């Protein structure tokens, strides 16, 4: 019981207990159990994912046991899905594994509805046909799909979720919601209420800010100067030349503390989304909370989001800091209640129970009010569609003969070649020579079929033939790590997922995200 918390400590410090819960309740579906799939799954079993299921029809080959850390020589000839399941199973006894000795295609035929069991579906090393088909089925089924592929020194990764909202965005670095520019009553009263180093830097800036406001009525914009001059105003207040570290600290925070209140552009857009504007019994929890946030802004929020209620640390008297800290804490608590009301009303006008949304959810939302984020991925169909193909992005990126998107195009060509030739370029050594041409033909065919006026160095046509469609472990491993975390993001809904196709080049040790 408590033994788990010891085993998962290092990660609990990242997504906390609730994240861990989400994870231990999920069920993942890995399509092919190659190195890529095996590595991705490895990074999910270790963390303690609830349960997984491997769907592989293929038999473990010689080269399969050669690049997979979860298939031994002893399992060559057996089912690749079952073989891997056993070895992966060993990593964590708290994870329950399962397998299906059939192909994706087979399942998509005899039973499409099968994938509705899964929280997420990770597919690896699939051919165009199977992807487009699976992508389609799952898109309609509302199932998150992540297509992963290792080809030579290239890592491919495309995520497909119609809409993924996230509250606990977890931003590295944000501005403090101190709001000196638009103080609230309680805050103002606190400042009026006023061991020289024992005084919080905020109260310091507030005092001199008030003074400056009298002798001006000005807020102190004029970056380069006014702020710089505001500093000198603070300096002329240091105890006869005693020291004052916090004073000098306040002077440094002046670069921040001035304007720290304004609704984030990204949130404005959430507010303006049809999903937020037009609510219905259909509307999911996230959007109802977003509306409540918007309503708040309009009414008691008076133009801004609920007060965060958290302040940075600051050299100051033990009791003074704690008092200051409560002013925000208490205010925040209030704004939260206000937002809460708007929720209940909204729920009622929809017919849902006022308690359809926990207080926990409410409190968390209000803390992250300024960091909400929504991601929406284009369907795989829209990308492959002749009219919808986002050529603006492709052509634009291709302005660099070596932009990672070269690799994307090459992958499409390789796919064309495969659809065409029924096999991949240069798999056998002697085929290389010949295929280099046949491949460029497909490349050009592909580029024309979509009207993509782009120049692709012939070098890349060579390289991919050299690759012989190999699945190098170190490459598969890289992808395995990145993919797993995106999957964990989907499950926990705790961070921000990349938007659409991610491309990694082991050659240059570089990568980029494309589309959207």
């Amino acid at each position: 019981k408590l033994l788990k918390e010891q085993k998962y400590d290092r990660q609990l410090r990242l997504w906390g207990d609730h994240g861990q819960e989400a994870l231990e309740s999920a069920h993942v579906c890995l399509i092919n159990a190659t190195a890529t799939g095996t590595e991705i799954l490895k990074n999910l079993v270790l963390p303690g994912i609830g349960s997984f299921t491997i769907i592989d029809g293929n038999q473990v080959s010689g080269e399969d046991a050669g690049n997979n850390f979860f298939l031994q020589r002893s399992s060559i000839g057996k089912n690749r899905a079952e073989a891997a399941m056993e070895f992966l199973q060993e990593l964590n006894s708290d994870v329950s594994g399962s397998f299906v000795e059939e192909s994706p295609e087979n399942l998509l035929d005899n039973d499409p509805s099968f994938f509705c069991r899964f929280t997420v579906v990770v597919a690896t090393q699939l051919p165009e046909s199977t992807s487009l088909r699976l992508a389609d089925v799952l898109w309609n089924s509302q199932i998150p799909l992540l297509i992963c592929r290792t080809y030579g020194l290239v890592g491919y990764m495309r995520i497909i979720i119609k809409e993924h909202p996230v509250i606990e965005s977890h931003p590295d670095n944000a501005l403090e919601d101190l709001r000196l520019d638009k103080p609230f009553p309680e805050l103002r009263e606190h400042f009026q209420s006023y061991d020289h180093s024992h005084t919080p830097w905020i109260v310091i800036i507030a005092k001199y800010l008030a003074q400056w406001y009298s002798e001006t009525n000005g807020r102190i914009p004029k970056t380069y100067k006014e702020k710089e001059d505001f500093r000198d105003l603070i300096r002329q207040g240091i105890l006869k030349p005693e020291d004052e570290e916090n004073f000098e600290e306040a002077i440094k925070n002046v670069n921040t503390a001035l304007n720290t209140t304004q609704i984030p552009s990204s949130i404005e857009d959430i507010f303006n989304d049809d999903r937020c504007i037009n609510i219905t019994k259909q509307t999911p929890s996230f959007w109802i909370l977003a509306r409540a946030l918007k309503e708040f802004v309009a009414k008691e929020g008076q133009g801004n989001l609920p007060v965060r209620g958290t302040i940075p640390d600051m050299i100051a008297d033990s009791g003074k800091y704690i008092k200051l800290q409560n002013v925000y804490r208490e205010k925040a608590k209030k704004d939260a209640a206000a937002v809460g009301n708007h929720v209940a009303k909204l729920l009622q006008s929809i017919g849902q129970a006022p308690e359809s949304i926990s207080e926990k959810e409410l409190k968390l939302l209000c803390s992250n009010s300024a960091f909400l984020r929504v991601v929406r991925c284009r369907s795989l169909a829209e990308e492959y569609g002749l009219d919808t193909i986002n050529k603006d992005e492709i052509i634009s990126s291709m302005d660099n003969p070596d932009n990672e998107i070269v690799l994307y195009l090459m992958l499409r060509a390789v796919d064309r070649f495969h659809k065409q030739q029924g096999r991949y370029p240069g798999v056998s050594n002697y085929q290389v020579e010949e295929d280099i041409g046949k491949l460029k033909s497909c490349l050009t065919g592909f580029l024309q079929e979509y009207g993509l006026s782009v120049m692709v160095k012939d070098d890349y046509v060579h390289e991919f033939c050299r690759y012989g469609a190999a699945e190098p472990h170190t490459i598969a491993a890289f992808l395995g790590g990145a993919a797993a975390q995106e999957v964990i993001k989907i499950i926990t809904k705790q961070f921000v997922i990349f938007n659409n196709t991610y491309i990694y080049s082991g050659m240059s040790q570089t990568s980029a995200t494309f589309q959207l």
């Binding site: 590295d172 670095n173 944000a174 501005l175 403090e176 970056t223 670069n255 921040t256």
Partner: protein
């Protein structure tokens, strides 16, 4: 002069600087916009890792130029 600095998540914000400003200040601009303590900022322009005591001019920065915030990690 209008330069761009890419965050450690590749955000990329735009900043106004005159070739006379110190690297030190370029960081203040970044903080001012992103809330990233200058203490933990490490800027990189074409290989050189900008010393916050020199000037933007010192590193041949010009309008369109792009700076990158970077880091090195301890764990393993």
């Amino acid at each position: 002069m209008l330069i761009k600095v890419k965050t450690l998540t590749g955000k990329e914000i735009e900043i106004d600087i005159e070739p006379t400003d110190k690297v030190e200040r370029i960081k203040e601009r970044v903080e001012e916009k992103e809330g990233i303590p200058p203490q933990q900022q490490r800027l990189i322009y074409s290989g050189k890792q900008m010393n916050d005591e020199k000037t933007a001019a010192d590193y041949k920065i010009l309008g369109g130029s792009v700076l990158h915030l970077v880091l090195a990690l301890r764990g393993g």
